[PDB]
């Protein structure tokens, strides 16, 4: 008959909407996030939203920068307690270097010394001590790399560096969807949706070229991108598999140190035990050589058929976009990823027992490529080693070619963002709207 | 079982235009590139256009004595494909072909059509 | 663009004989180490088809009689024996630049 506006509170629907999320952790000193969060929820609750294909995008997902800015303010705050190096800032002289050498790139190790200041403000110390190529450069006399840019603060030698997962859960009022389609390209109508209060844990990995100890793709390897036509654009590839690699530093290097002022010391690299050797790292070549496999014929799917698929080293950019990352045991290494890369593919086999990369060590570092700043890096006590597993690619196009048969890639980096998204995609916030109204007939007494 | 199926041929008169079209079947068209030749006794087989995927933004090449009066285009939902022609010449009669180019990195017509006769006059 | 010349123009061949047809790209078919020449057979009432590819592998079907030949720019088809099945029109084509180009549609018949 008569149609009346009705009223309804409690109903179940949702806006998109950006909201702060808060950070929890199952975890004694650490750089990491452990230190603002509180204690997780050991089984989070999951409840499928039936009939649902809400939109996902993970391009646009503000999530990510939520979780870029907290890392880095954490980081920064890590090192507010630590010791400033700034009388350091000396003439450096150097006396090239003198072991039972097998060496590396000619000059690599460095034997110098200088006047150090001491405890009271009437005296000098006479030090001397060991540096990379990569921490000095030359003015005979040198500078320590960066004095001329940016203060230097040593990293506290007790706190760890070491990954620990972060939860992130919703406010209330707020609710976070999780996309559980298989192989989402992180785009469109997802067919399977549910709500959790809270995500998985995610590690706060830092890696270049190769995303280390991430998730692995359910089935196959998933290649996605924000455009796949502009090659400016990086394109993410998440494995289906792991391929383990070994790295390891066999120097056996001693630690020294001198107490600086009434309230700091310093430490550095002392006399090296034994044998002077490159570091490097190890891949099984037979995984590799299947895990290209698997990867070039997703990018046959894409790019079409008929394509010949090239791959090579970055042509240019600075160490820290051209090499391969790595944080193992507080040491910071460069690796060189040539030979991973070196290949070209027709038959779905290359036209052509393990992989050894060679690394570089540098203990003067910007994790976050900021202006003005830097971080100088304790030394570890004897050999390290490390084991882990890729599970991702960064790669762009070079060519680009659409007048071609052929294509070719190289390996991308630089922007810490894609490597968060690898994990974030999965999940979208919605903000909780209570309010609504109906047509039912129905009459009310006065 | 791949398949391709050309229609839309037949006689045109000269200066005029026509659209051919070619049906994929038993293939997915949008993971494929594509191709056409034609063939007359005259001058044997001579390839005129091929189109591109996404990721390549559709582009297309023409071979020059067709570029500027032919056109080709595709439509990936309905898994066909189209050559569109225009400023039709005497030249142009003979056998057109709906083409795949095959073996990987060893780029090839693999699969050919029936294909249809086009004469111009 | 890229010229591909063959020759003979045709030839006939008598039952049980060795056929050969000749292909010279004025560039190289040559990238990667590997030829781009592809070779074709034709008969009247039917598309080309596919016989050699990279040239010197054979398509999926074909018989053992036909092999591929050469390098650089000096390439050639050898078939043997000839029979009546053989019958075709031969092109060679260089795949290895757009625009593409075919050969000169080598008539083989029996003598």
């Known amino acids: 008959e008569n149609l009346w506006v009705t009223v309804y509170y409690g109903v179940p629907v949702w806006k998109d909407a950006e909201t702060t999320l808060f950070c929890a952790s199952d975890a004694k000193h650490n750089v990491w996030a452990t230190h603002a969060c509180v204690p997780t929820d050991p089984n989070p609750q999951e409840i499928h939203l039936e009939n649902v294909t809400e939109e996902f995008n993970m391009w646009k997902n503000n999530m990510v920068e939520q979780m870029h800015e907290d890392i880095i303010s954490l980081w920064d705050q890590s090192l507010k307690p630590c010791v400033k190096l700034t009388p350091l800032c000396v003439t450096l002289q150097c006396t090239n270097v003198t072991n039972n050498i097998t060496d590396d790139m000619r000059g690599e190790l460095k034997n110098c010394s200088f006047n150090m200041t001491t405890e009271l403000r009437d005296k000098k110390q006479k030090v001397y001590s060991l540096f990379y190529r990569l921490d000095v450069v030359q003015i005979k006399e040198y500078r320590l790399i960066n004095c001329n840019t940016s203060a230097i603060t040593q990293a506290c030698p007790k706190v760890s560096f070491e990954p620990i997962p972060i939860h992130y859960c919703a406010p209330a009022g707020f609710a976070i969807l999780k996309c559980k389609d298989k192989k989402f390209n992180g785009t469109g109508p997802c067919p399977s949706v549910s709500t959790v209060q809270c995500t998985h844990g995610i590690k706060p990995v830092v890696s270049t070229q190769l995303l280390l100890n991430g998730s692995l793709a359910e089935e196959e390897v998933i290649i996605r991108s924000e455009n796949i036509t502009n090659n400016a654009k990086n394109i993410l590839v998440q494995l289906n598999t792991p391929v383990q690699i070994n790295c390891t530093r066999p120097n056996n290097n001693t630690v020294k140190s001198i107490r600086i002022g009434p309230g700091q010391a310093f430490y550095y690299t002392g006399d090296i035990i034994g044998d002077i050797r490159q570091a490097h790292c190890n891949v099984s070549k037979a995984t590799w050589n299947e895990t290209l496999g698997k990867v070039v014929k997703q990018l046959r799917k894409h790019f079409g058929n008929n394509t010949i698929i090239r791959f090579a080293q970055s042509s240019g950019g600075d160490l820290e976009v051209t090499t391969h990352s790595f944080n193992c045991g507080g040491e910071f290494f460069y690796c060189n990823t040539s030979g991973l890369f070196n290949s070209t593919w027709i038959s779905n086999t290359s036209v052509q027992d393990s992989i050894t990369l060679p690394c570089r060590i540098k203990q003067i570092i910007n994790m976050w490529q900021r202006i003005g700043q830097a971080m100088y890096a304790p030394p570890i006590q004897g050999v390290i080693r490390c084991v882990s597993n890729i599970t991702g690619l960064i790669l762009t196009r070079d060519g680009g070619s659409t007048n071609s048969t052929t294509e070719t890639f190289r390996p991308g980096g630089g922007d810490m963002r894609d490597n968060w998204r690898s994990e974030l995609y999965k999940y979208k916030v919605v903000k909780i709207e209570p309010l609504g109204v109906a047509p039912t007939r129905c009459k009310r007494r006065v | 079982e791949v398949k391709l199926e050309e229609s839309g041929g037949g006689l045109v008169q000269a200066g005029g235009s026509m659209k051919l079209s070619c049906v994929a079947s038993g293939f997915s068209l949008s993971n494929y590139w594509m191709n056409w030749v034609r063939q007359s006794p005259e001058k044997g087989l001579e390839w005129v256009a091929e189109?591109?995927?996404?990721?390549?933004?559709?582009?297309?090449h023409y071979a020059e004595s067709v570029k500027g009066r032919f056109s080709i285009s595709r439509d990936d939902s309905r898994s066909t494909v189209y050559l569109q022609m225009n400023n039709l010449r005497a030249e142009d009669t003979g056998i057109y072909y709906c083409?795949?180019?095959?073996?990987?990195?060893?780029?090839?017509?693999?699969?050919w059509g029936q294909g249809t006769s086009v004469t111009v006059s | 663009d890229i010229v591909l010349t063959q020759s003979p123009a045709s030839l006939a061949v008598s039952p049980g004989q060795r056929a050969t047809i000749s292909c010279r790209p004025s560039?190289?078919?040559?990238?990667?180490?590997?030829?781009?020449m592809n070779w074709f057979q034709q008969k009247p009432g039917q598309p080309p088809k596919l016989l050699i590819y990279?040239?010197?592998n054979r398509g999926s079907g074909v018989p053992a009689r036909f092999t591929g030949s050469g390098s650089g720019t000096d390439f050639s088809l050898n078939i043997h024996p000839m029979e009546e099945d053989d019958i075709a029109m031969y092109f060679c084509?260089?795949?290895?630049?757009?625009?593409?180009?075919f050969g000169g549609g080598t008539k083989l018949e029996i003598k």
């Open positions: 083409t795949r180019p095959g073996y990987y990195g060893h780029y090839a017509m693999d699969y």
């Open positions: 560039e190289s078919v040559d990238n990667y180490g590997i030829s781009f």
């Open positions: 990279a040239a010197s």
């Open positions: 189109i591109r995927l996404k990721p390549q933004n559709y582009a297309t």
């Open positions: 084509q260089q795949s290895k630049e757009v625009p593409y180009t």
